[PDB]
mmCIF file of all heavy atoms in Angstrom:
data_model
loop_
_atom_site.group_PDB
_atom_site.id
_atom_site.type_symbol
_atom_site.label_atom_id
_atom_site.label_comp_id
_atom_site.label_asym_id
_atom_site.label_seq_id
_atom_site.Cartn_x
_atom_site.Cartn_y
_atom_site.Cartn_z
ATOM 1 N N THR A 1 94.212 118.817 58.222
ATOM 2 C CA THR A 1 94.095 117.976 59.360
ATOM 3 C C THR A 1 94.399 118.625 60.679
ATOM 4 O O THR A 1 93.681 118.476 61.677
ATOM 5 C CB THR A 1 94.930 116.658 59.228
ATOM 6 O OG1 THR A 1 94.445 115.931 58.110
ATOM 7 C CG2 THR A 1 94.865 115.798 60.486
ATOM 8 N N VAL A 2 95.544 119.308 60.731
ATOM 9 C CA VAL A 2 95.941 119.978 61.945
ATOM 10 C C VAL A 2 95.050 121.216 62.186
ATOM 11 O O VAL A 2 94.718 121.462 63.344
ATOM 12 C CB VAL A 2 97.443 120.459 61.943
ATOM 13 C CG1 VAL A 2 97.776 121.152 63.234
ATOM 14 C CG2 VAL A 2 98.362 119.296 61.662
ATOM 15 N N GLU A 3 94.597 121.862 61.143
ATOM 16 C CA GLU A 3 93.720 123.024 61.262
ATOM 17 C C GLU A 3 92.423 122.605 61.963
ATOM 18 O O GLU A 3 91.897 123.299 62.857
ATOM 19 C CB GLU A 3 93.403 123.607 59.910
ATOM 20 C CG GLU A 3 92.708 125.010 59.870
ATOM 21 C CD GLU A 3 92.267 125.438 58.519
ATOM 22 O OE1 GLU A 3 92.539 124.675 57.542
ATOM 23 O OE2 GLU A 3 91.662 126.492 58.434
ATOM 24 N N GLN A 4 91.912 121.430 61.568
ATOM 25 C CA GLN A 4 90.625 120.904 62.076
ATOM 26 C C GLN A 4 90.794 120.471 63.517
ATOM 27 O O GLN A 4 89.911 120.707 64.344
ATOM 28 C CB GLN A 4 90.104 119.771 61.233
ATOM 29 C CG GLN A 4 89.636 120.235 59.863
ATOM 30 C CD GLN A 4 88.530 121.345 59.976
ATOM 31 O OE1 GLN A 4 87.624 121.201 60.804
ATOM 32 N NE2 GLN A 4 88.620 122.336 59.114
ATOM 33 N N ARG A 5 91.933 119.853 63.856
ATOM 34 C CA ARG A 5 92.213 119.386 65.195
ATOM 35 C C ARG A 5 92.283 120.629 66.101
ATOM 36 O O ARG A 5 91.955 120.521 67.259
ATOM 37 C CB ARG A 5 93.566 118.679 65.234
ATOM 38 C CG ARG A 5 93.909 118.144 66.568
ATOM 39 C CD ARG A 5 92.763 117.292 67.205
ATOM 40 N NE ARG A 5 93.204 116.723 68.525
ATOM 41 C CZ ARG A 5 92.345 116.157 69.325
ATOM 42 N NH1 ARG A 5 91.054 116.024 69.038
ATOM 43 N NH2 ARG A 5 92.796 115.585 70.459
ATOM 44 N N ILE A 6 92.826 121.755 65.565
ATOM 45 C CA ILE A 6 92.914 123.002 66.312
ATOM 46 C C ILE A 6 91.602 123.659 66.653
ATOM 47 O O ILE A 6 91.371 124.071 67.773
ATOM 48 C CB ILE A 6 93.895 123.989 65.562
ATOM 49 C CG1 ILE A 6 95.328 123.612 65.655
ATOM 50 C CG2 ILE A 6 93.665 125.427 66.117
ATOM 51 C CD1 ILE A 6 96.265 124.384 64.727
ATOM 52 N N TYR A 7 90.675 123.660 65.672
ATOM 53 C CA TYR A 7 89.344 124.101 65.856
ATOM 54 C C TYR A 7 88.593 123.237 66.830
ATOM 55 O O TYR A 7 87.802 123.721 67.616
ATOM 56 C CB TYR A 7 88.598 124.108 64.491
ATOM 57 C CG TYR A 7 89.247 125.063 63.475
ATOM 58 C CD1 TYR A 7 89.060 124.772 62.104
ATOM 59 C CD2 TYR A 7 89.927 126.181 63.879
ATOM 60 C CE1 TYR A 7 89.650 125.644 61.161
ATOM 61 C CE2 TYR A 7 90.489 127.048 62.910
ATOM 62 C CZ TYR A 7 90.349 126.762 61.577
ATOM 63 O OH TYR A 7 90.931 127.618 60.646
ATOM 64 N N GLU A 8 88.859 121.925 66.757
ATOM 65 C CA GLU A 8 88.221 120.954 67.632
ATOM 66 C C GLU A 8 88.668 121.228 69.062
ATOM 67 O O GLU A 8 87.835 121.451 69.964
ATOM 68 C CB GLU A 8 88.630 119.522 67.263
ATOM 69 C CG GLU A 8 87.765 118.498 67.820
ATOM 70 C CD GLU A 8 88.061 117.077 67.304
ATOM 71 O OE1 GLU A 8 89.180 116.902 66.774
ATOM 72 O OE2 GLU A 8 87.205 116.160 67.405
ATOM 73 N N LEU A 9 90.001 121.260 69.295
ATOM 74 C CA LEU A 9 90.520 121.501 70.650
ATOM 75 C C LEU A 9 90.200 122.859 71.179
ATOM 76 O O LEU A 9 90.266 123.117 72.407
ATOM 77 C CB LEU A 9 92.051 121.365 70.620
ATOM 78 C CG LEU A 9 92.528 119.920 70.421
ATOM 79 C CD1 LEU A 9 94.000 119.859 70.147
ATOM 80 C CD2 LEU A 9 92.188 119.038 71.643
ATOM 81 N N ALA A 10 89.865 123.800 70.260
ATOM 82 C CA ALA A 10 89.560 125.171 70.706
ATOM 83 C C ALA A 10 88.023 125.311 70.810
ATOM 84 O O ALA A 10 87.489 126.355 71.324
ATOM 85 C CB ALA A 10 90.076 126.193 69.704
ATOM 86 N N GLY A 11 87.291 124.321 70.318
ATOM 87 C CA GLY A 11 85.839 124.387 70.202
ATOM 88 C C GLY A 11 85.354 125.566 69.469
ATOM 89 O O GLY A 11 84.414 126.306 69.865
ATOM 90 N N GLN A 12 86.012 125.906 68.321
ATOM 91 C CA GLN A 12 85.781 127.194 67.641
ATOM 92 C C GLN A 12 86.752 127.386 66.479
ATOM 93 O O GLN A 12 87.966 127.108 66.604
ATOM 94 C CB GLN A 12 85.903 128.323 68.608
ATOM 95 C CG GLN A 12 85.691 129.691 67.967
ATOM 96 C CD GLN A 12 86.159 130.772 68.913
ATOM 97 O OE1 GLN A 12 86.237 130.623 70.143
ATOM 98 N NE2 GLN A 12 86.409 131.943 68.327
ATOM 99 N N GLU A 13 86.252 127.882 65.433
ATOM 100 C CA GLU A 13 87.119 128.208 64.256
ATOM 101 C C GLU A 13 87.607 129.652 64.392
ATOM 102 O O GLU A 13 86.841 130.560 64.888
ATOM 103 C CB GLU A 13 86.403 127.997 62.944
ATOM 104 C CG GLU A 13 85.886 126.560 62.779
ATOM 105 C CD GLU A 13 85.437 126.171 61.399
ATOM 106 O OE1 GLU A 13 85.274 127.133 60.553
ATOM 107 O OE2 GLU A 13 85.198 124.979 61.139
ATOM 108 N N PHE A 14 88.831 129.933 63.942
ATOM 109 C CA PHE A 14 89.391 131.233 64.013
ATOM 110 C C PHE A 14 90.591 131.345 63.094
ATOM 111 O O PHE A 14 90.948 130.326 62.490
ATOM 112 C CB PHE A 14 89.842 131.580 65.446
ATOM 113 C CG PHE A 14 90.940 130.680 66.036
ATOM 114 C CD1 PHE A 14 92.278 131.185 66.117
ATOM 115 C CD2 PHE A 14 90.680 129.396 66.428
ATOM 116 C CE1 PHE A 14 93.263 130.359 66.607
ATOM 117 C CE2 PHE A 14 91.652 128.559 66.938
ATOM 118 C CZ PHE A 14 93.010 129.046 67.019
ATOM 119 N N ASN A 15 91.216 132.502 63.010
ATOM 120 C CA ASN A 15 92.380 132.688 62.104
ATOM 121 C C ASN A 15 93.670 132.393 62.895
ATOM 122 O O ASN A 15 94.161 133.277 63.601
ATOM 123 C CB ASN A 15 92.461 134.032 61.463
ATOM 124 C CG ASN A 15 93.555 134.117 60.411
ATOM 125 O OD1 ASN A 15 94.335 133.132 60.192
ATOM 126 N ND2 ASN A 15 93.729 135.316 59.885
ATOM 127 N N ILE A 16 94.207 131.235 62.700
ATOM 128 C CA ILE A 16 95.351 130.770 63.384
ATOM 129 C C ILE A 16 96.598 131.655 63.042
ATOM 130 O O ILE A 16 97.503 131.771 63.898
ATOM 131 C CB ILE A 16 95.582 129.281 63.097
ATOM 132 C CG1 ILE A 16 94.299 128.466 63.329
ATOM 133 C CG2 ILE A 16 96.713 128.790 63.951
ATOM 134 C CD1 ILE A 16 94.327 127.022 62.776
ATOM 135 N N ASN A 17 96.618 132.192 61.862
ATOM 136 C CA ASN A 17 97.749 132.992 61.457
ATOM 137 C C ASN A 17 97.694 134.468 61.943
ATOM 138 O O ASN A 17 98.637 135.251 61.602
ATOM 139 C CB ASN A 17 97.915 132.997 59.913
ATOM 140 C CG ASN A 17 98.440 131.692 59.425
ATOM 141 O OD1 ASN A 17 97.943 131.084 58.505
ATOM 142 N ND2 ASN A 17 99.560 131.184 60.001
ATOM 143 N N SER A 18 96.745 134.817 62.678
ATOM 144 C CA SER A 18 96.740 136.116 63.328
ATOM 145 C C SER A 18 97.159 135.965 64.799
ATOM 146 O O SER A 18 96.416 135.436 65.606
ATOM 147 C CB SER A 18 95.284 136.666 63.312
ATOM 148 O OG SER A 18 95.267 137.829 64.193
ATOM 149 N N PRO A 19 98.399 136.441 65.116
ATOM 150 C CA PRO A 19 98.828 136.364 66.453
ATOM 151 C C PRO A 19 97.895 137.021 67.493
ATOM 152 O O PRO A 19 98.083 136.875 68.703
ATOM 153 C CB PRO A 19 100.207 137.032 66.443
ATOM 154 C CG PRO A 19 100.687 136.897 65.005
ATOM 155 C CD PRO A 19 99.388 137.029 64.209
ATOM 156 N N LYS A 20 96.914 137.763 66.971
ATOM 157 C CA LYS A 20 95.952 138.395 67.918
ATOM 158 C C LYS A 20 94.714 137.495 68.093
ATOM 159 O O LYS A 20 94.276 137.311 69.215
ATOM 160 C CB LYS A 20 95.623 139.822 67.431
ATOM 161 C CG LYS A 20 96.712 140.791 67.803
ATOM 162 C CD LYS A 20 96.362 142.289 67.507
ATOM 163 C CE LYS A 20 97.499 143.255 67.865
ATOM 164 N NZ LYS A 20 97.082 144.689 67.834
ATOM 165 N N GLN A 21 94.117 136.981 67.005
ATOM 166 C CA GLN A 21 92.983 136.104 67.174
ATOM 167 C C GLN A 21 93.412 134.828 67.964
ATOM 168 O O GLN A 21 92.667 134.281 68.785
ATOM 169 C CB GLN A 21 92.405 135.663 65.840
ATOM 170 C CG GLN A 21 91.642 136.764 65.105
ATOM 171 C CD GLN A 21 91.025 136.257 63.852
ATOM 172 O OE1 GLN A 21 90.294 135.256 63.902
ATOM 173 N NE2 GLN A 21 91.296 136.922 62.696
ATOM 174 N N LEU A 22 94.643 134.430 67.730
ATOM 175 C CA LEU A 22 95.225 133.257 68.423
ATOM 176 C C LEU A 22 95.460 133.551 69.906
ATOM 177 O O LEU A 22 95.096 132.730 70.728
ATOM 178 C CB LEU A 22 96.586 132.872 67.778
ATOM 179 C CG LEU A 22 97.261 131.742 68.554
ATOM 180 C CD1 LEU A 22 96.500 130.453 68.401
ATOM 181 C CD2 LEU A 22 98.768 131.583 68.049
ATOM 182 N N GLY A 23 96.041 134.709 70.198
ATOM 183 C CA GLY A 23 96.244 135.112 71.588
ATOM 184 C C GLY A 23 95.043 135.149 72.383
ATOM 185 O O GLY A 23 95.005 134.906 73.600
ATOM 186 N N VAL A 24 93.859 135.409 71.782
ATOM 187 C CA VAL A 24 92.553 135.460 72.457
ATOM 188 C C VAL A 24 92.080 134.018 72.716
ATOM 189 O O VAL A 24 91.537 133.758 73.802
ATOM 190 C CB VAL A 24 91.529 136.148 71.564
ATOM 191 C CG1 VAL A 24 90.157 136.181 72.261
ATOM 192 C CG2 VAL A 24 92.004 137.531 71.209
ATOM 193 N N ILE A 25 92.316 133.073 71.812
ATOM 194 C CA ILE A 25 91.909 131.711 71.982
ATOM 195 C C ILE A 25 92.728 131.121 73.128
ATOM 196 O O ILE A 25 92.198 130.458 74.022
ATOM 197 C CB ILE A 25 92.118 130.887 70.729
ATOM 198 C CG1 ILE A 25 91.150 131.246 69.612
ATOM 199 C CG2 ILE A 25 91.983 129.414 70.986
ATOM 200 C CD1 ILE A 25 89.698 130.937 69.943
ATOM 201 N N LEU A 26 94.015 131.415 73.123
ATOM 202 C CA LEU A 26 94.926 130.762 74.008
ATOM 203 C C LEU A 26 94.801 131.361 75.400
ATOM 204 O O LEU A 26 94.671 130.648 76.412
ATOM 205 C CB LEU A 26 96.366 130.970 73.596
ATOM 206 C CG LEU A 26 96.732 130.310 72.255
ATOM 207 C CD1 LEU A 26 98.193 130.580 72.049
ATOM 208 C CD2 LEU A 26 96.433 128.786 72.258
ATOM 209 N N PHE A 27 94.827 132.674 75.485
ATOM 210 C CA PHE A 27 95.039 133.411 76.768
ATOM 211 C C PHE A 27 93.684 133.871 77.364
ATOM 212 O O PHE A 27 93.691 134.315 78.525
ATOM 213 C CB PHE A 27 96.030 134.530 76.548
ATOM 214 C CG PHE A 27 97.328 134.056 76.066
ATOM 215 C CD1 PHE A 27 97.822 134.484 74.807
ATOM 216 C CD2 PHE A 27 98.123 133.222 76.807
ATOM 217 C CE1 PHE A 27 99.064 134.048 74.323
ATOM 218 C CE2 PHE A 27 99.405 132.826 76.353
ATOM 219 C CZ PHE A 27 99.836 133.208 75.078
ATOM 220 N N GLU A 28 92.569 133.791 76.615
ATOM 221 C CA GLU A 28 91.263 134.079 77.122
ATOM 222 C C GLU A 28 90.291 132.840 77.177
ATOM 223 O O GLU A 28 89.980 132.339 78.249
ATOM 224 C CB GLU A 28 90.633 135.265 76.338
ATOM 225 C CG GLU A 28 91.534 136.465 76.334
ATOM 226 C CD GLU A 28 90.939 137.692 75.647
ATOM 227 O OE1 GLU A 28 89.705 137.630 75.329
ATOM 228 O OE2 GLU A 28 91.672 138.642 75.462
ATOM 229 N N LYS A 29 89.897 132.343 76.014
ATOM 230 C CA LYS A 29 88.996 131.133 76.009
ATOM 231 C C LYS A 29 89.634 130.007 76.754
ATOM 232 O O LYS A 29 88.968 129.260 77.506
ATOM 233 C CB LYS A 29 88.577 130.710 74.625
ATOM 234 C CG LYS A 29 87.622 129.540 74.638
ATOM 235 C CD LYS A 29 87.156 129.143 73.260
ATOM 236 C CE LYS A 29 86.042 128.044 73.349
ATOM 237 N NZ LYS A 29 85.402 127.828 71.976
#
């Protein structure tokens, strides 16, 4: 449920457990 809400709010699926893929979603997109 939280994973899906995260993809929704990010408008995109990614690997949340990678502090690098996450850093891109947060600090770029």
Side-chain angles (χ1 to χ4, degrees):
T1 295
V2 181
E3 193 187 358
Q4 289 303 317
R5 179 55 175 170
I6 285 169
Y7 298 151
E8 196 175 20
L9 291 169
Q12 179 194 337
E13 304 193 347
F14 65 104
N15 185 3
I16 308 166
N17 286 131
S18 171
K20 284 189 181 186
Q21 290 185 51
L22 175 66
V24 182
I25 290 292
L26 297 180
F27 302 115
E28 306 184 10
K29 183 177 185 169

